[PDB]
Point group: D2
Chain length 494, copies 4
């Protein structure tokens, strides 16, 4: 058990010789240059996030080229992620750029576009045309990061709601609105999204962080928008509200992974429930064998302070203990004053937590949830991990061209590094969001097709050896493929 593992631990013992968790850094003006990106990579960045809420295609093109230049100069593979702006609900403009809302006061929110450019404290525009048919009397409208809270009293007409201002807040033009109780039916992907996504396809991005996913069918729209040429791009669904949490089973099934957006979830969901949601979503993904990212409000105070709060450190450690594959930095690296130091600290926290985490509890819990009879692929990968524990093997080598079996092996949480040997550089990059895995590129063009597998196996073994994971006389568990991996070897390291 984890409890039994805790008794045996000492904080003055040396830490693990590898970090399993993976760090996603969002790129901005602090970090867009190749020297800044090289600093990031060396600090621990595995994944570069592009926030398409800001900047233009040219700005992001520069991120892409610079990431690739930085990775090539350091001899590594860094994933590139496109985070979509997504559909939004915003207020319109206000007469005088401003509207002083006062507690107890009554106001009117309109679907009528005529008021888009002349709102006041008394009556203003909201750009979601289905607003009235989705909201009922009693429901709440949150405006400006949920700072202003309105309660709906009644429908004045088909397009207008009578609202009570429940607290004093002064709002400006084009502020973002949230609908806590309501099933927002905005399209999955907007127009900008659809052109961003084709840009991403054209620039060969590795994954999509798809904003505001509330439904399984919405995952299909991101898929269709990515088109036939985008079929190999991973779709990571951002879970940001109650709907997404409620439909999580069907969303996970359709997507390639999940981001837990704690800050966004917290706008309508009490903080203590988001903590629990994080547990649920992470575990569901762990059992599905799909990467899961813990995001927003991670080491936030370290954007301008050289040091985070203790509660922040603890937040990051427990993300790892929950079982997150990935931890993500936002403003801390995009606009922050200490981009290198925040990534380095995050690597240190993850590594410390990993040294305390009992991987076997994960292995055993997930193995118990398998129904007998298992299919071959599932039996092979769980057996391989089992053999790691039984022989105390010190590494795994998995031959996987698409990364699929590498993810299936990682799902079972061996207590040793996984080395994936693959013939696709895109697999190396995409595996950067799966914990416990390091990828080795084997160049089938430069080296042959290695149909017997021996060269790839030696490449993985050699990598493991050069990182000090295995030495002469150690065990290494090898798995390989015809479609999936059906073959296992327990190899004595020479």
């Amino acid at each position: 058990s984890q409890l039994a593992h805790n008794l045996t631990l000492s904080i003055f013992d040396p830490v693990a010789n590898y970090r399993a968790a993976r760090i996603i850094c969002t790129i901005g003006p602090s970090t867009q240059s190749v020297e800044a990106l090289k600093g990031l990579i060396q600090s621990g960045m595995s994944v570069a996030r592009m926030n398409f809420s800001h900047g233009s295609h040219e700005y992001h093109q520069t991120t892409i080229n610079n990431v690739r230049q930085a990775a090539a100069e350091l001899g590594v593979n860094i994933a590139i992620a496109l985070d979509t702006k997504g559909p939004e609900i915003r207020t319109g403009q206000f007469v005088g750029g401003d509207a002083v809302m006062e507690r107890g006061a009554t106001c009117y929110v309109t679907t009528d576009p005529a008021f888009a450019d002349k709102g006041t404290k008394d009556k203003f525009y909201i750009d979601y045309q289905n607003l009235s048919k989705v909201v009922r009397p009693g429901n709440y409208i949150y405006i400006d990061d949920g700072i202003l809270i309105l309660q709906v009293q009644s429908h004045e007409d088909e397009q207008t709601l009578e609202c009570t201002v429940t607290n004093s807040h002064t709002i400006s033009d084009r502020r973002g609105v949230n609908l806590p109780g309501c099933d927002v039916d905005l399209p999955a992907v907007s127009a900008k999204d659809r052109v961003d996504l084709q840009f991403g396809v054209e620039q060969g991005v590795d994954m999509i962080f798809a904003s505001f996913i509330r439904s399984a069918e919405q995952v299909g729209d991101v898929r269709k928008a990515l088109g036939p040429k985008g079929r190999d791009i991973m779709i990571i669904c951002k879970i940001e509200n109650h709907q997404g949490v409620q439909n999580i089973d069907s969303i996970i099934e359709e997507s390639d992974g999940i981001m837990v957006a704690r800050g966004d979830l917290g706008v309508e969901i009490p903080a203590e429930k988001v903590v629990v949601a994080q547990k649920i979503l992470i575990s569901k993904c762990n059992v599905a064998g799909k990467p899961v990212i813990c995001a927003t409000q991670m080491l936030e105070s370290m954007t301008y302070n050289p040091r985070p709060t203790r509660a922040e450190v603890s937040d990051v450690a427990n993300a790892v203990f929950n079982g997150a594959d990935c931890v993500m930095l936002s403003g801390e690296t995009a606009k922050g004053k200490y981009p290198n130091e925040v990534v380095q600290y995050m690597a240190r926290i993850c590594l410390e937590a990993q040294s305390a985490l009992n991987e076997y509890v994960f292995f055993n819990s997930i193995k118990k949830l398998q129904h007998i009879p298992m299919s071959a692929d599932e039996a092979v990968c769980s057996s391989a991990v089992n053999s790691v524990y039984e022989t105390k093997a010190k590494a795994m080598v998995v031959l996987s061209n698409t990364g699929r079996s590498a993810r299936l092996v990682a799902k079972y949480r061996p207590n040793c590094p996984i080395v994936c040997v693959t013939t696709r550089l895109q697999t190396c990059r995409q595996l950067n969001i799966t914990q416990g895995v390091e990828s080795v590129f084997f160049d089938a063009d430069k080296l042959g097709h290695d149909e017997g597998k021996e060269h790839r196996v030696a490449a993985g073994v050699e990598f493991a050896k050069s990182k000090g994971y295995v030495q002469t006389g150690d065990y290494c568990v090898v798995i390989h493929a015809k479609g999936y991996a059906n073959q296992t070897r327990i190899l004595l390291v020479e």
Copy 2:
């Protein structure tokens, strides 16, 4: 497993009908009056902490008196905890009340008392006389909550160290110092502690939060300081540095429990290691069946803001997930602006965490670790909890005069409330640091010794009924006499 449990949860599901975890509140200006304390109790306070780092005996007598009154007025039992100042290492005074220390500069720290009242940036006093024989070249000295860091280069003489100032910080007089690598050999209790501990025994305090505990032997010196009149007072050891952490097994053995003082540990140990040390110390106490408190910087930003940070909330939740019996408030209640709200929210987080927590993982993990043969008490308490799971009983009733068997049952973490029926009011108070237990007092001098146990058992079941834990047709596991008799009871 916890992982398997997580799969089945829905955050919209209703929370449990009871909060197992317990809340300790530090009393200060914000909360010392009877009506404030009354607010605190109804908000969720189980233990009143008196911080003896400040305030006179007159001030804490006012806290003591006021707590007992507020509690009596509400007809409840509140524990009173005396949190000692403890031994300290401080700098001396400085010429001009101040000393501007600069990175790269060299300074001299002296054991020589002559410099106590005339320190400068170049040479100043430190009041720990064994400083030089404990510190080696390479070691660090932390000053002023570890903001100023000095590295020791060499011994200038027997009483003086040559130090490099490794960072720029301006310090004032009498600032606290820490020795990260070093086995500090300061005594267990200070001279002020002895006066304070004697005072606590006189005023009938329920427990001591004993500061800066580093070894098992030191627990006994605290014990000797309370005397024969104070032998039923619980000693909860505050663990604050690497020695306490290293010596934790033997310290847990001698103590009645442990406080994980994160902030003090954090002065000397990287924050990520403190997080792990919390996990270790909590689980060791769970297994020992002794109470553990998660203390310091729990909901700190709610001292002056009406809501805490999201990270602070997860910190509280994860202390519950770790297995803590108690969570503690300091300035949030002592000097804070929202004392009631902070306690009510702490209560709400705990309850939410508890609803997601799979108790059976705890029961089972702890069970798996018991050596066989078990002694009778161990066997009876673990069986009875096992019986709760196997018959899906909705309450336990534990007849315990000293609280011992109530603590032993609570150790095994049944997934239902534990009602302890006891003949000592002090037991009612002391069980307030044990999760999952509520106490009912049975006045044996007024009502008889109840040798057949019927009256005390009925008192327990009645309490459970009154609270909505059980109704007609439900099972209640009853344990009694240390305990060796178990009964599976159909509720009438």
Copy 3:
């Protein structure tokens, strides 16, 4: 596991200080006298069987009185069992007392009573009137302990079957017949049975061994025949053919226990399948918590030889390993030359086997089959046994007036003696068919009602102590009751 337990065993280790299995001896002319019965008891007899296939009421009255005299002289309680003659199918008489049946020959078997007293090799009587409507062409008729086998060719008329004699055998008058494939629908209890059973009720017998039980409804007929005054008499169902084996679940539910009649089952069922049937029936009873008796062909050769075959010893040991509560002797004690020596040897075999049997495998297998939530009685008894294993308690004491909780505790197979303290002498006798239990009579008339339970608990503890099971400083697990046992104590022996 049992396998793991086998590794640790040594045959030169001393045996257990108690025998858990119980010995049933059938009384006959060899053993009917009070001195012979006293020899039996001292040899290990717990139960006296009366075979009502032979002898008259006066003969059996003498058995009853003598058993009671013998038990009273030795200060013990011995159960008395009435084994019913049961319904039978027999041939009629033959012209000349004899009929030479020859392989290949054709004969005719008739339901017509006119031929009852004048059968020949060509045509003879069978007294089961539903014979023709139960038998089909192809079916077999077994005659004279299955020595003569006939195959049915056709129905000559409504009352007559044309049969081929499939083997050469010479039969005499009134020989017993078996119908291997057929659902024999003879009444549960005959006329003799119904008058025997009322005799048994009148003489206060402890249990019925009900012959030829094939159906659950038949158990009800034994029950109705026992009448209102017989309600407390245990009905042990004898399983003797495929029907009884096929309906075993419903039979066990209705009865108070089961006898596995191996010899009888073997007439129509191949020997190797009866071995398996024994496993099935014993385990089903173990899980139901109802006594099960292994009977017939036990130490058979020891009827006239001073020593049994090795295969016989092995048969008896494996009955114990299967989990039988009881082993039964028939001719070996009824008509045998070595009645004392066969019981003594059987006690020795049982004791040796018990020393090799891992009780925990029984406890754990049965505990695993309980559905959560358990009812209180079930949770209490399994917990009590669990506590024996966890504290290595050396005895149990169970207060049980009807014996019901004593049987429920025994079901869970603690690895220590169970002491039942009861206020009914009939409970002491009836518990003689439950393994691992010894009974102590507490006389509520002579000693009071002991509503607080303390005296009965001391009586059980004292008994345990006087047999050397527990000494000062040992643990004893006490269970007691209001209906069932809801209360448990772990007591330190003074």
Copy 4:
């Protein structure tokens, strides 16, 4: 559990499509001819036992020759086992060919050879020269299959014991004697054994059933007696007295397997203890992954009757339940009237027992006992069997040249047939004493070394298909190179 499995069984359910247990048959007058042996093979014989207690080298050469011919004619592989006479203790001769021993009478047993040819009821010879220094007063001497029991009263001299005749029995010349309490120190191999063992190496026998094995050291003396030319011959140790039983761990360590010789054990040990010794020895071998044979008085009454007793049938079934790899026939086939019928029936009992037996209990019990870390071979073989259960595979294919990995897989008891593909015919023969395995021979000199393993794997799957074990869409677990490579294969 086995108990839980029993609940689900129906005796009318069809038996398994394969018999895991193996049948050894002793050859004699009833069965020495090629057509008789042919009858035996088709009836279910896997091993031909030659009992060297009787018959000349010429007689057993006839058995050897005839077995190989019968097997070749049927296109199968049959193992040939040489069962040695071993060291013996016998009485001498008697005046008049006879000696009437009477209960209560006193007699004298002498080590002095002068009395070898003139013993009487009063004084007779015993040929074990260390008899007096091994026997103490109180000890028993068993004579003539333990029918005559003598108790030792005292030493009359250095070579002579005063004995009480404890029961009435008439003995003849050269009768066998047993020493129940005593550590018999007779040599491992007799002079006749050496001649016989050398003969077996010359004739290429597959295994030795080594008589009267008492200690681990004795296994090596048998080994040394076979020489370098006989190093691949398996030594199966016949355990026949208390020394073999006591020393079983170390004996199993040195041996290639164990025969539980019930009848010989029964001369000296009560029959109920022999039953338990069978359980112990069988389970120890299962755990060691070495073959164990249950031998002697298995279906003895079927020597002269057409059907056995019911107790004999349960005895055969329970040897299978115990975990025996093999069951053995002696006079039933050597001198019996129904050799074919006895083997066919033995086969039928085994198959019925196997159908009721839950293999998973074995797999799991043996698994639970493996120390961690496992060595690679152990890990690979146990995983692969685990894989059979988890994917419900219907066959295993094991590429094993020496048979080692085939024995290691068979140890873990998958619930499906094991096909061993091997390049040595001797391995085909030797695996006939390992349950659950069938062997396919791959002629590497004729077909190539098959370094890619494809041809041998296809040979295995093909065999499994031919036998009805697998069809299209079924899983087959393949293990190969000792073994370290596992493949879960979809059958085409």
